[PDB]
Amino acid sequence: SAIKPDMKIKLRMEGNVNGHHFVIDGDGTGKPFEGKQSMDLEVKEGGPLPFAFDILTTAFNRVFTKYPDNIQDYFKQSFPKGYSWERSLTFEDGGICIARNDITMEGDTFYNKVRFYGTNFPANGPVMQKKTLKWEPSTEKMYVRDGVLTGDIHMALLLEGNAHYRCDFRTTYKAKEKGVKLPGYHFVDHCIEILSHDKDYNKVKLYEHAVAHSGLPDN
Amino acid sequence: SAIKPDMKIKLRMEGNVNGHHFVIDGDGTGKPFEGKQSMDLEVKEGGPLPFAFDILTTAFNRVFTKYPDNIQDYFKQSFPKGYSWERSLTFEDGGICIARNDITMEGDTFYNKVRFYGTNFPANGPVMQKKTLKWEPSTEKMYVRDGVLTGDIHMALLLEGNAHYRCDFRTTYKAKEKGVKLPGYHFVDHCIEILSHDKDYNKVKLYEHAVAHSGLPDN
Amino acid sequence: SAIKPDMKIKLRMEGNVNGHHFVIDGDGTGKPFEGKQSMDLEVKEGGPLPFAFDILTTAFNRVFTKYPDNIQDYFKQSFPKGYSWERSLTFEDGGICIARNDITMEGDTFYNKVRFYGTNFPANGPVMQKKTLKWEPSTEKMYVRDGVLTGDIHMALLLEGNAHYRCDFRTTYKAKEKGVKLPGYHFVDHCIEILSHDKDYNKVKLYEHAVAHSGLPDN
Amino acid sequence: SAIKPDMKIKLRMEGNVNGHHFVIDGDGTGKPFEGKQSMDLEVKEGGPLPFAFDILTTAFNRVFTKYPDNIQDYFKQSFPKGYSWERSLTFEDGGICIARNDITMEGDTFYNKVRFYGTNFPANGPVMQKKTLKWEPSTEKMYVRDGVLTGDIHMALLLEGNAHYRCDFRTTYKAKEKGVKLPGYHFVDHCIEILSHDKDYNKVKLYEHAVAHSGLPDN
């Protein structure tokens, strides 16, 4: 019974994108067994951000995924001790980000130690010009590679003017504790959304919904 | 109204993989509005194949996709005149394939002119050693890029010994007729499966099921 | 040894690019120990070509490389029996080509059986619109990977309007005979040029100069 | 006139690799017009480093390149005001690094503000296990892309046991001052070398030699 149906979330992100330093605090709440989660974010340093806030949002826990009984839930099995993930975000225009989160737990509260770094965004590109609207929904492919749980995603940012700006995700997920049983090949559907924000995005309210599945023919 | 609920499928593939020439004939049936399709394949030249048959199977029509009414069906709109697609298959171990299909229609029957080429498969790899079992199911991301309909997929071959061998698909789809309406960003779930085969895979029965959707939260 | 300071070259290429079939014959001469080589090419089928001829030109023998004594010459050691290579050409705009050449020798003459395939060139792109001028010179990195001699190159096509169109080469080189000694990590500088051509590029005269080296400080 | 034939070099690097924080100070000298440079490095925080020191070494100025007169020297023209570069290091085994350097000048001294970040290095890989010997020499391809000076390199680390571990560099170089003339397509040969180090690599002496050129036939 280590994970409770209602959990609190504390987060701190430190980052550097195109040479710009920043620090962002996060405070949120979530329902792990329903695969849903919400968070309020506040830029504590480096505001106002000179880049598109949307690039950060997926760095702000796969614990908040609705897993069917017939699929192994690696993420919930990682607790109480916790787990870490490392991610690479490869954008179609040469922009490249890397990110990390060390996730632990105390009582009803998840703690997130997050780092986010980025370079090679063109000065006239959508991220530096803040021409982003939202991430499209996605389907993350979960598989094991040399004993490490890995997720690959084809992601896309919707742009002003109804074009799309493509990004490839790769994430590695590692439990702290030895001998957590790895899952079989499966899928995780995503939908992430900014519900509200102030003008400079110094304050942002974020929401995520995510569900695991086995694909066709078992839709 | 050109596409009928029950369609016949005639196919011919010429190919060359790691220097090995081959020709494969195909004869099948399908239900376009249900997104389901079947085919019998016969190796006419270059049998027995020295590589894994599984690499070819997705080259053996997105017409056979179940589209909801709220998503534009580019593929069914492309007929009677037809359409063509070009695909790149980038394998994790440097192996690389390209393929193409020109698709036309006469009365009841789809005609498929298919080409398939491949190089740089390591001699000790799963393809050249025929250590493949099946493709996992997939979710193809459909989007428009510079006016061209494009699908990217994270694909995986299940190996003997329950490991996975990763491949990235990219496909472009082009209607023959000029003014066919492009769809919005959406998804196509896949499941492709070899139902039966003889020992050397000179005769193979193939099946595909595919459904289009808009992701979460509408799933 | 088998290789004479002046050699003849016979070549035959069969190809398919963006669905377009073609056949090209080649007749040339070269100085292996000087790393220089020349060839006359004639399109025998599929002329006039609807794509940029420049794409093909590196498929038209690393035997013609000037090797210093302190670097192992894998290519000249492969004869009389010969060798084969397989290449992938990954273009910046998604265009993708693969090629292969089986090279044998009789008396003073090299024989080249060549295949060249390509897909996913955008209809609007520099290749399909024949906006290419030349390949820039290059430096190919030669190294051994899992017992196979491999060369990676950062290539670039100079475009009309003085822009550049980038392509990544990867080539594997395999001697036909067992136990040809592999070289250490080294470099091969290239310069390939079209000396002349008729209007439709049905007839083309081609030239290559190539020199092996060990990099700094020995330049 | 801003660049003198003998120059001093002051450097500070902050970094984070696989979650490990570190700070490294650097003090060196160089001969810009000869393309030669050397530096003493001292780990001030996070020592001893749990990863291979070699990965950092190219982050420790293209000013120190020997440019011929017939090629535009963007880097020396960027002073006194200075310039910045941003780099991506994509390793063959999924490991990925990013780096940045803001370079300024006062009197005879260059000042380097450097950041270096890395994730997704496998725990059993050559970087995390410190199985690295040296970078091979290299040839960087310099070209302009959408008005930005860019360098791509095929790099390789020599491993214990005489294998190679491949990495792709991409770097963007941006002068601080408006209207510094961009160069034409050209090449920069490199050779970087650790001259000495203590057991834990808390103290390291580094050397670089680099020469620009136009390739064959003028090599």
GROMACS .gro file of N, CA, C and O in nm, chain A residues 9 11 24-29 38-42 196 203-206:
model
   72
    9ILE      N    1   0.249   1.650  -0.476
    9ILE     CA    2   0.366   1.656  -0.562
    9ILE      C    3   0.445   1.784  -0.536
    9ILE      O    4   0.392   1.894  -0.550
   11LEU      N    5   0.812   1.972  -0.647
   11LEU     CA    6   0.906   1.967  -0.758
   11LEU      C    7   0.994   2.090  -0.757
   11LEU      O    8   0.947   2.202  -0.738
   24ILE      N    9   1.259   2.680  -1.142
   24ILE     CA   10   1.113   2.674  -1.140
   24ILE      C   11   1.065   2.579  -1.030
   24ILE      O   12   1.105   2.463  -1.024
   25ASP      N   13   0.978   2.630  -0.943
   25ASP     CA   14   0.917   2.549  -0.839
   25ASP      C   15   0.780   2.501  -0.884
   25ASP      O   16   0.709   2.569  -0.959
   26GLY      N   17   0.743   2.383  -0.836
   26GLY     CA   18   0.617   2.322  -0.874
   26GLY      C   19   0.545   2.262  -0.755
   26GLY      O   20   0.607   2.201  -0.667
   27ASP      N   21   0.414   2.277  -0.754
   27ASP     CA   22   0.332   2.226  -0.645
   27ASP      C   23   0.201   2.173  -0.702
   27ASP      O   24   0.127   2.245  -0.768
   28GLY      N   25   0.175   2.044  -0.682
   28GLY     CA   26   0.064   1.979  -0.749
   28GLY      C   27   0.004   1.861  -0.677
   28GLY      O   28   0.041   1.829  -0.563
   29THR      N   29  -0.092   1.798  -0.744
   29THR     CA   30  -0.170   1.693  -0.685
   29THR      C   31  -0.211   1.596  -0.795
   29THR      O   32  -0.213   1.633  -0.912
   38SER      N   33  -0.203   1.713  -1.181
   38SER     CA   34  -0.212   1.857  -1.199
   38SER      C   35  -0.103   1.926  -1.121
   38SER      O   36  -0.064   1.878  -1.015
   39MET      N   37  -0.059   2.043  -1.167
   39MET     CA   38   0.049   2.114  -1.099
   39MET      C   39   0.050   2.263  -1.128
   39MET      O   40   0.027   2.307  -1.241
   40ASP      N   41   0.080   2.341  -1.025
   40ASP     CA   42   0.102   2.484  -1.039
   40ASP      C   43   0.251   2.513  -1.038
   40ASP      O   44   0.324   2.466  -0.950
   41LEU      N   45   0.296   2.593  -1.134
   41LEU     CA   46   0.437   2.619  -1.153
   41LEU      C   47   0.464   2.767  -1.138
   41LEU      O   48   0.385   2.850  -1.182
   42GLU      N   49   0.577   2.799  -1.076
   42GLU     CA   50   0.615   2.938  -1.055
   42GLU      C   51   0.763   2.957  -1.084
   42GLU      O   52   0.848   2.891  -1.024
  196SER      N   53  -0.376   2.716  -1.775
  196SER     CA   54  -0.370   2.862  -1.762
  196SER      C   55  -0.227   2.911  -1.744
  196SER      O   56  -0.139   2.834  -1.706
  203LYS      N   57   0.382   3.217  -1.408
  203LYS     CA   58   0.294   3.125  -1.337
  203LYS      C   59   0.211   3.043  -1.436
  203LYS      O   60   0.148   3.098  -1.527
  204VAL      N   61   0.214   2.911  -1.419
  204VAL     CA   62   0.154   2.820  -1.515
  204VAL      C   63   0.084   2.706  -1.442
  204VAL      O   64   0.140   2.646  -1.350
  205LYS      N   65  -0.037   2.675  -1.485
  205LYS     CA   66  -0.109   2.559  -1.436
  205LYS      C   67  -0.111   2.448  -1.541
  205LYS      O   68  -0.152   2.470  -1.654
  206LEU      N   69  -0.066   2.330  -1.500
  206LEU     CA   70  -0.039   2.221  -1.593
  206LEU      C   71  -0.124   2.098  -1.558
  206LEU      O   72  -0.152   2.074  -1.441
   0.00000   0.00000   0.00000
